[PDB]
C-alpha cells in the first residue's frame, strides 16, 4: 500500500464507523425510518469507498447493539420476510419480493459489519413493535428508494406503496389488524381496483 | 403459472445453502436499489404433468442472527429445507434443535427435507451418515447426504418435492 492509499483507507473507515453509528443511534431510538434511511447510507458509502463488512468489525469493537436495538432488528427481519413471501403471487413476484428482500439484506449488512458470522442476536423477548407499524416502515421506505418509472404489475410501484400504507393504516383505525388481515395487504398487487394507481 | 411454490432454505453461513442454490437461477428483474443490496431468493420454472410451476426460494437474509424460531420460520411456505455441513459438528447440533421445533410449530402438510452437504470438497467429514439418519427418522422427516462433488440427488429431491406438493394442492 502507498501511504495515500493507508491514509485514504482509514479515513474511509472512520466514516463508515460514524455511518454504522447513525444507524445504531436510529435503532436504539426505534425510529424506524430514520434506521433504514442510515443503513442505506451506510451501504451505499461502503460500496463507494470499497469496503467490506470484514474491513469495518474492527473499528467497531466498543459499540454494541443493545437488547432493544436486537428486538427491532428480529421485528424488522420477521416482517420484511413475511412480506417478501406474501408479496410473492401468481399475478407478480419480482418486483415487490425483490424491493422488500433488498430492504432485508440491507438491515442484515448492518448487521454482519458489527457481528462474525453466525454470531447470534441478542433481541429483548419482551419487546414488542407492532408488525403493522413495521410493515408502513418497509413501505415508506421502498416508496422513498423504488425508481419513480417502477411498476408492481400494472401499478406504480410508489402509488402502490401509498395504497398499502393506506390500508394498513386503516386497518389499524378499525382494530382490525391481524396476520390475515395484513396478509390481504401484502399479497394484494391491486387487481381488483378501478384504476392503475400512478404516482404523478 | 399454473403454480407458484415458496420454499425456505435454513442454515447457517458457511454451511453450504450456496451448493444448493446452485439447482436455481438469479431473477433478472432490476432496477437501481435491487441492484444495489441484492436479493436473496432464487427462481426455477419447471414443466409438470402438463402444467408451468414457479419455484420460488429464501435463503432468507440475516437469518443467522434470530435462532429463536418464531412464525417466519414455520408459516408461509409449501416447503423447508434445513441444511448442515457434515464437517461440523456444531452445525449439526444446531439444525437438530432448529429443525424440532420448525416441524412442532409448522402445519403438518408443509413438505420438510434434512441435507447434509460437503460443499467444499478440501474439507473433513465428521457427522455420520448413521446418526443424522437417526434424527430424520425421530422427525419423521427425508434425509439426503450429498457432496459437491455430485448434484444429482439434490436436483432429484427439489424434483420430488414439486410433485409432493403439487399433488397435495
Same mark, same amino acid.
Request: net charge neutral; charged share 25%; aromatic share 8%.
Given at each position: 500500500?502507498?501511504?495515500?492509499?493507508?491514509?485514504?483507507?482509514?479515513?474511509?473507515?472512520?466514516?463508515?464507523? $460514524?455511518?454504522?453509528?447513525?444507524?445504531?443511534?436510529?435503532?436504539?431510538? *426505534?425510529?424506524?425510518?430514520?434506521?433504514? +434511511?442510515?443503513?442505506?447510507?451506510?451501504?451505499?458509502?461502503?460500496?463507494?469507498? =470499497?469496503? $467490506?463488512?470484514?474491513?469495518?468489525?474492527?473499528?467497531?469493537?466498543?459499540?454494541?447493539?443493545?437488547? +432493544?436495538?436486537?428486538?427491532?432488528?428480529?421485528?424488522?427481519?420477521?416482517?420484511?420476510?413475511?412480506?417478501?413471501?406474501?408479496?410473492?403471487?401468481?399475478?407478480?413476484?419480482?418486483?415487490?419480493?425483490?424491493?422488500?428482500?433488498?430492504?432485508?439484506?440491507?438491515?442484515?449488512?448492518?448487521?454482519?459489519?458489527?457481528?462474525?458470522?453466525?454470531?447470534?442476536?441478542?433481541?429483548?423477548?419482551?419487546? +414488542?413493535v *407492532?408488525?403493522?407499524?413495521?410493515?408502513?416502515?418497509?413501505?415508506?421506505?421502498?416508496?422513498?428508494?423504488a425508481?419513480?418509472?417502477?411498476?408492481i404489475?400494472?401499478?406504480?410501484?410508489?402509488?402502490?406503496?401509498?395504497? $398499502?400504507?393506506?390500508?394498513?393504516? +386503516?386497518?389499524?383505525?378499525?382494530?382490525?389488524? =391481524?396476520?390475515?388481515?395484513?396478509?390481504?395487504?401484502?399479497?394484494?398487487? *391491486?387487481?381488483?381496483?378501478?384504476?392503475?394507481?400512478?404516482?404523478? | 403459472?399454473?403454480?407458484?411454490?415458496?420454499?425456505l432454505?435454513?442454515?447457517?453461513?458457511g454451511?453450504?445453502?450456496?451448493?444448493?442454490?446452485?439447482?436455481?437461477?438469479?431473477?433478472?428483474?432490476?432496477?437501481?436499489?435491487?441492484?444495489?443490496?441484492?436479493?436473496?431468493?432464487?427462481?426455477?420454472?419447471?414443466?409438470?404433468?402438463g402444467?408451468?410451476?414457479?419455484?420460488?426460494?429464501?435463503?432468507?437474509?440475516?437469518?443467522?442472527?434470530?435462532?429463536?424460531?418464531?412464525?417466519?420460520?414455520?408459516?408461509?411456505?409449501?416447503?423447508?429445507?434445513?441444511?448442515?455441513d457434515?464437517?461440523?459438528?456444531?452445525?449439526?447440533?444446531?439444525?437438530?434443535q432448529?429443525?424440532?421445533?420448525?416441524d412442532?410449530?409448522?402445519?403438518?402438510?408443509?413438505?420438510?427435507?434434512?441435507?447434509?452437504?460437503?460443499?467444499?470438497?478440501?474439507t473433513?467429514?465428521?457427522?455420520?451418515?448413521?446418526?443424522?439418519?437417526?434424527?430424520?427418522?425421530?422427525?419423521?422427516?427425508?434425509?439426503?447426504?450429498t457432496?459437491?462433488k455430485?448434484?444429482?440427488?439434490?436436483?432429484?429431491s427439489?424434483?420430488?418435492?414439486?410433485?409432493?406438493?403439487?399433488?397435495?394442492?
Amino acid at each position: 500500500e502507498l501511504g495515500v492509499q493507508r491514509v485514504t483507507r482509514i479515513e474511509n473507515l472512520e466514516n463508515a464507523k $460514524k455511518l454504522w453509528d447513525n444507524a445504531n443511534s436510529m435503532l436504539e431510538k *426505534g425510529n424506524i425510518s430514520g434506521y433504514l +434511511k442510515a443503513a442505506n447510507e451506510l451501504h451505499k458509502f461502503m460500496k463507494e469507498k =470499497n469496503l $467490506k463488512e470484514d474491513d469495518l468489525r474492527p473499528e467497531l469493537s466498543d459499540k454494541t447493539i443493545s437488547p +432493544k436495538g436486537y428486538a427491532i432488528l428480529q421485528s424488522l427481519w420477521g416482517a420484511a420476510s413475511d412480506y417478501s413471501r406474501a408479496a410473492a403471487t401468481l399475478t407478480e413476484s419480482t418486483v415487490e419480493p425483490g424491493l422488500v428482500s433488498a430492504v432485508n439484506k440491507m438491515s442484515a449488512f448492518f448487521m454482519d459489519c458489527k457481528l462474525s458470522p453466525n454470531e447470534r442476536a441478542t433481541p429483548d423477548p419482551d419487546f +414488542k413493535v *407492532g408488525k403493522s407499524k413495521i410493515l408502513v416502515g418497509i413501505m415508506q421506505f421502498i416508496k422513498d428508494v423504488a425508481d419513480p418509472t417502477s411498476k408492481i404489475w400494472m401499478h406504480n410501484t410508489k402509488a402502490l406503496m401509498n395504497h $398499502k400504507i393506506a390500508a394498513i393504516q +386503516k386497518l389499524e383505525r378499525s382494530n382490525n389488524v =391481524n396476520d390475515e388481515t395484513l396478509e390481504s395487504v401484502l399479497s394484494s398487487k *391491486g387487481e381488483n381496483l378501478s384504476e392503475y394507481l400512478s404516482y404523478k | 403459472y399454473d403454480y407458484l411454490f415458496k420454499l425456505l432454505l435454513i442454515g447457517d453461513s458457511g454451511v453450504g445453502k450456496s451448493c444448493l442454490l446452485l439447482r436455481f437461477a438469479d431473477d433478472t428483474y432490476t432496477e437501481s436499489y435491487i441492484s444495489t443490496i441484492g436479493v436473496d431468493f432464487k427462481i426455477r420454472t419447471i414443466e409438470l404433468d402438463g402444467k408451468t410451476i414457479k419455484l420460488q426460494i429464501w435463503d432468507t437474509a440475516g437469518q443467522e442472527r434470530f435462532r429463536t424460531i418464531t412464525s417466519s420460520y414455520y408459516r408461509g411456505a409449501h416447503g423447508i429445507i434445513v441444511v448442515y455441513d457434515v464437517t461440523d459438528q456444531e452445525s449439526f447440533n444446531n439444525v437438530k434443535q432448529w429443525l424440532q421445533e420448525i416441524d412442532r410449530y409448522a402445519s403438518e402438510n408443509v413438505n420438510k427435507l434434512l441435507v447434509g452437504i460437503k460443499c467444499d470438497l478440501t474439507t473433513k467429514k465428521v457427522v455420520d451418515y448413521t446418526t443424522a439418519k437417526e434424527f430424520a427418522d425421530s422427525l419423521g422427516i427425508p434425509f439426503l447426504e450429498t457432496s459437491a462433488k455430485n448434484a444429482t440427488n439434490v436436483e432429484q429431491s427439489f424434483m420430488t418435492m414439486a410433485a409432493e406438493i403439487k399433488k397435495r394442492m
